[PDB]
Amino acid sequence: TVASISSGPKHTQKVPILTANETGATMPVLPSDSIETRTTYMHFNGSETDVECFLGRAACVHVTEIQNKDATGIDNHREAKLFNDWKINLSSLVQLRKKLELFTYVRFDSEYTILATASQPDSANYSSNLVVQAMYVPPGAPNPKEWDDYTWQSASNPSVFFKVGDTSRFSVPYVGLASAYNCFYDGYSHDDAETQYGITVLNHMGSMAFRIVNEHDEHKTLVKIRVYHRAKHVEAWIPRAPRALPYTSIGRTNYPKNTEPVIKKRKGDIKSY
Amino acid sequence: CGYSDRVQQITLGNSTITTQEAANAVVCYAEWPEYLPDVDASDVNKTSKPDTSVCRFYTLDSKTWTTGSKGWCWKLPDALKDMGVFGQNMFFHSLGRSGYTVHVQCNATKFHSGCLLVVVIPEHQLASHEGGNVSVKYTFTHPGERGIDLSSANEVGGPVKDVIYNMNGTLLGNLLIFPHQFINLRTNNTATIVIPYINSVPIDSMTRHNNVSLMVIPIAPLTVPTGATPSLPITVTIAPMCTEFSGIRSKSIVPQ
Amino acid sequence: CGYSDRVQQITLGNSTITTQEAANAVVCYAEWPEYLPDVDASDVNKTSKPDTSVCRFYTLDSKTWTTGSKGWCWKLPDALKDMGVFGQNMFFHSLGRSGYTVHVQCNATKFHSGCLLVVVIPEHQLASHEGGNVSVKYTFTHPGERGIDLSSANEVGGPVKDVIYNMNGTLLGNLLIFPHQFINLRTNNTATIVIPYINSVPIDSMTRHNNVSLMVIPIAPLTVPTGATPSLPITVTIAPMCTEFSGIRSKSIVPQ
Amino acid sequence: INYYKDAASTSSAGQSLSMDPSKFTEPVKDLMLKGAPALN
Amino acid sequence: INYYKDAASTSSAGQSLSMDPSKFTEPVKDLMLKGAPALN
RNA sequence: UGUUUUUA
Numbered sequence: 037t038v039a040s041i042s043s044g045p046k047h048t049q050k051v052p053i054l055t056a057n058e059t060g061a062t063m064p065v066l067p068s069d070s071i072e073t074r075t076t077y078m079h080f081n082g083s084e085t086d087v088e089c090f091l092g093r094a095a096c097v098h099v100t101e102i103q104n105k106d107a108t109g110i111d112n113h114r115e116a117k118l119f120n121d122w123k124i125n126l127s128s129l130v131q132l133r134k135k136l137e138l139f140t141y142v143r144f145d146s147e148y149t150i151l152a153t154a155s156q157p158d159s160a161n162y163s164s165n166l167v168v169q170a171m172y173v174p175p176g177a178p179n180p181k182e183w184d185d186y187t188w189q190s191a192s193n194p195s196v197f198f199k200v201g202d203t204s205r206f207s208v209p210y211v212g213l214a215s216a217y218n219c220f221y222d223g224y225s226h227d228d229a230e231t232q233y234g235i236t237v238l239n240h241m242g243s244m245a246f247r248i249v250n251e252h253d254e255h256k257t258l259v260k261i262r263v264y265h266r267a268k269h270v271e272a273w274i275p276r277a278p279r280a281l282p283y284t285s286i287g288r289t290n291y292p293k294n295t296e297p298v299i300k301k302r303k304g305d306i307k308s309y
Numbered sequence: 310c311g312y313s314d315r316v317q318q319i320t321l322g323n324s325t326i327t328t329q330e331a332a333n334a335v336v337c338y339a340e341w342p343e344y345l346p347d348v349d350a351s352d353v354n355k356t357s358k359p360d361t362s363v364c365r366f367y368t369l370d371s372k373t374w375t376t377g378s379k380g381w382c383w384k385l386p387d388a389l390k391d392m393g394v395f396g397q398n399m400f401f402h403s404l405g406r407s408g409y410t411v412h413v414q415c416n417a418t419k420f421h422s423g424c425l426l427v428v429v430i431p432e433h434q435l436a437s438h439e440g441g442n443v444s445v446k447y448t449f450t451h452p453g454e455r456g457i458d459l460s461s462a463n464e465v466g467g468p469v470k471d472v473i474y475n476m477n478g479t480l481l482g483n484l485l486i487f488p489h490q491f492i493n494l495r496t497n498n499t500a501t502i503v504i505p506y507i508n509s510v511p512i513d514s515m516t517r518h519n520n521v522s523l524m525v526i527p528i529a530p531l532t533v534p535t536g537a538t539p540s541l542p543i544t545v546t547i548a549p550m551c552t553e554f555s556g557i558r559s560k561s562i563v564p565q
Numbered sequence: 566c567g568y569s570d571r572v573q574q575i576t577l578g579n580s581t582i583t584t585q586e587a588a589n590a591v592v593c594y595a596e597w598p599e600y601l602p603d604v605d606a607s608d609v610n611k612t613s614k615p616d617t618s619v620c621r622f623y624t625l626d627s628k629t630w631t632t633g634s635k636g637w638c639w640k641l642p643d644a645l646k647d648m649g650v651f652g653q654n655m656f657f658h659s660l661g662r663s664g665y666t667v668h669v670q671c672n673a674t675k676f677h678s679g680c681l682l683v684v685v686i687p688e689h690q691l692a693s694h695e696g697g698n699v700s701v702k703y704t705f706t707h708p709g710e711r712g713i714d715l716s717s718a719n720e721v722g723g724p725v726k727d728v729i730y731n732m733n734g735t736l737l738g739n740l741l742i743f744p745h746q747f748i749n750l751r752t753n754n755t756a757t758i759v760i761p762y763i764n765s766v767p768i769d770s771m772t773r774h775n776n777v778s779l780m781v782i783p784i785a786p787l788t789v790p791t792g793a794t795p796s797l798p799i800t801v802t803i804a805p806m807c808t809e810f811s812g813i814r815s816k817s818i819v820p821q
Numbered sequence: 822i823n824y825y826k827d828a829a830s831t832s833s834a835g836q837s838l839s840m841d842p843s844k845f846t847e848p849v850k851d852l853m854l855k856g857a858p859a860l861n
Numbered sequence: 862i863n864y865y866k867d868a869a870s871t872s873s874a875g876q877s878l879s880m881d882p883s884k885f886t887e888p889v890k891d892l893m894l895k896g897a898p899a900l901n
Numbered sequence: 902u903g904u905u906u907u908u909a
Binding site (some may be wrong): 048050051052054055056058059060061062063064065069081082083086088089092145146207208209210268269270275 | 825827829831832833834835836837838840842845846848849853856857859860
């Protein structure tokens with residue numbers, strides 16, 4: 037593939053350097069149009085700028101603390117952190133969010149990696165060989181209410197069991213109702229004065245509940261679970277203006293009041309280098 | 310062989326737009342608007358294609374461009390909800406699908422200076438000014454032919470109106486990634502942007518959801534000659550095309 | 566080879582009518598409704614053919630048939646002026662042309678006695694009760710889905726309501742020259758009359774002029790069995806077909 | 822060789838060698854040639 | 862490729878593409894056509 | 902021919 041063609045002096049009524057940007061078109065003007073050029077080759081395919089490479093590597097999306105301890109005399113196992121629930125979203129960790137939000141619609145198969153790591157901050161004699169259950173709870177399915185509820189049975193729900201310290205890895209096909217996920221939704225659930233803007237179930241990947249299936253030991257062991265998401269077979273539409281200001285909420289384009297200027301003010305005038 | 314690309318005529322239905330200072334029309338993503346094909350269709354109901362009774366130019370109430378104007382934003386199909394038969398069909402049907410020919414008009418003398426950015430943003434999800442997880446209320450996102458004036462004050466439950474941040478936390482300079490055209494008064498008096506139907510679904514509710522958002526933003530401020538009225542009218546004219554409606558039904562009631 | 570001519574289904578748009586006691590449908594003057602052809606066309610404007618969004622069954626508010634009911638009259642397209650998208654198009658366009666499938670419904674037991682005359686009268690020019698050269702006022706000739714109840718009292722500027730004289734000075738017995746069907750309760754519970762567009766002009770104003778008039782007239786009075794409610798509901802369901810509209814325009818304002 | 826029944830189980834597709842920047846760079850109705858007057 | 866002698870060792874069969882809802886929906890002696898009077 | 906490539 038040719039990068040630069042050979043081009044000599046130009047004395048022409050065709051002025052490739054003159055155009056009208058008022059047209060909204062970016063004319064493919066080359067160095068060969070402005071200067072005298074030598075022949076060069078690309079030696080480059082552009083493999084790393086493909087959306088599958090750009091959007092298609094693993095990223096931390098969720099981190100959660102859960103405790104394996106005695107469940108006696110506890111009324112809410114979700115809030116005592118015997119299990120925690122995560123409404124699946126890629127909009128909670130901003131670095132990945134910005135990448136996805138370069139586009140309006142994205143259709144990808146997912147590949148999750150869950151890494152559970154234990155810690156016994158208080159007196160412990162040993163490192164317990166805990167097994168975490170990661171349970172996929174799609175909308176409508178009974179969300180677990182107790183750490184050993186009938187829900188965890190997962191007779192129809194997808195579920196993964198893996199040892200703490202070790203990891204789980206499972207693929208998930210594109211689960212969107214539409215032909216693509218909406219990174220942005222300029223609309224409502226219905227025509228209602230108080231209904232939620234932007235937030236829609238078009239992006240309801242589902243939920244993930246995490247428990248340690250082990251019974252309690254005498255010591256408290258804190259398990260920090262980290263969910264990693266990798267997009268595969270990525271298709272992306274409608275490129276957007278990159279995010280400039282920081283986020284405030286999941287699924288909202290909201291930015292903080294009194295936020296700092298993002299355009300990097302010069303030292304000196306417009307003439308400075 | 311002589312003629313001109315600045316002199317254009319668009320005839321849709323019984324409506325005709327002419328321009329003598331046109332910049333080359335933009336066709337968003339090089340894709341012309343088309344009826345939904347059977348291979349992409351989900352809804353089984355035979356779609357009403359209303360032809361020339363709706364596929365015509367509706368001119369929107371003019372805006373006044375001053376030296377201190379920040380800009381204006383319209384939502385589609387929202388802006389055309391009160392426009393003739395299109396609006397009626399919009400409210401009588403559960404599902405709607407439409408492309409648009411947007412035509413923005415701002416004429417001035419050869420002594421005038423200023424540049425408008427006319428840009429079409431698909432899924433222009435607005436940001437609340439209250440920050441946090443505060444929602445933008447239905448009434449503010451669906452203003453109608455009035456649109457949103459970005460020079461105005463904020464309202465409780467209303468959107469953020471700092472044109473610099475595109476009302477969404479992105480920078481103004483980058484809007485050029487979206488299908489856009491400038492009205493540079495020295496060059497151009499009319500922008501035109503043909504919008505196809507852009508959605509993740511083949512057809513959608515026209516009332517609850519706005520597919521695209523038209524923004525007209527002064528970049529280079531209006532500089533009028535000495536002794537002139539420090540104002541120019543900006544007139545927006547929109548024509549639906551390849552419009553489809555499905556699931557006819559009792560007229561939908563919306564807020565306000 | 567067995568089956569039935571009393572069991573009928575008419576599907577128009579998203580609407581479906583079924584009957585199990587039908588008398589053979591009447592097609593006025595053996596002519597099915599059709600779009601206006603180019604050889605009969607006068608108006609140069611391309612006609613809006615609204616398809617299935619208007620070409621569907623609109624059921625009219627039911628009437629109560631008593632022993633003392635004289636009859637009811639509807640004007641078309643007047644009766645459908647408030648019906649969905651058809652009504653909107655009717656008011657938004659200068660010119661309109663439409664055929665109709667009229668479906669009149671009156672069910673009873675095998676113990677009931679009575680006969681309705683369901684008749685379609687083109688150019689049913691009503692007579693004033695005041696005689697002389699007194700005109701019938703717009704409001705009375707354009708009642709809408711309410712229609713004219715002939716059992717009612719006379720009104721100043723209103724029509725004459727003696728069903729015997731067909732409101733026009735002709736005798737009731739002769740209405741059978743017009744495309745008609747009886748609902749004879751012993752035989753039939755449903756009349757159906759497919760009306761083509763009938764006018765001296767290829768297309769006409771739908772607001773100022775009523776092309777046809779539907780009359781439902783009890784001939785043999787309702788005789789209910791002993792101990793029964795001395796009433797039967799009569800429901801009229803009308804579907805526009807081959808509907809054309811031309812000269813889209815600001816919505817017309819009519820009296821009332 | 823794919824070890825699974827599901828398409829979602831497969832690896833990434835690599836690269837779409839098919840580019841066309843024109844849909845973003847030149848989304849114009851009338852054709853504009855480099856060198857020709859943009860407007861006439 | 863099956864790594865075992867036993868049929869029980871194999872993976873699931875995927876999908877039986879052969880449906881026939883008729884045995885449940887239309888378990889009638891005489892044939893009933895959509896449109897024809899159900900009884901005559 | 903104020904001509905641009907390719908090959909000895």
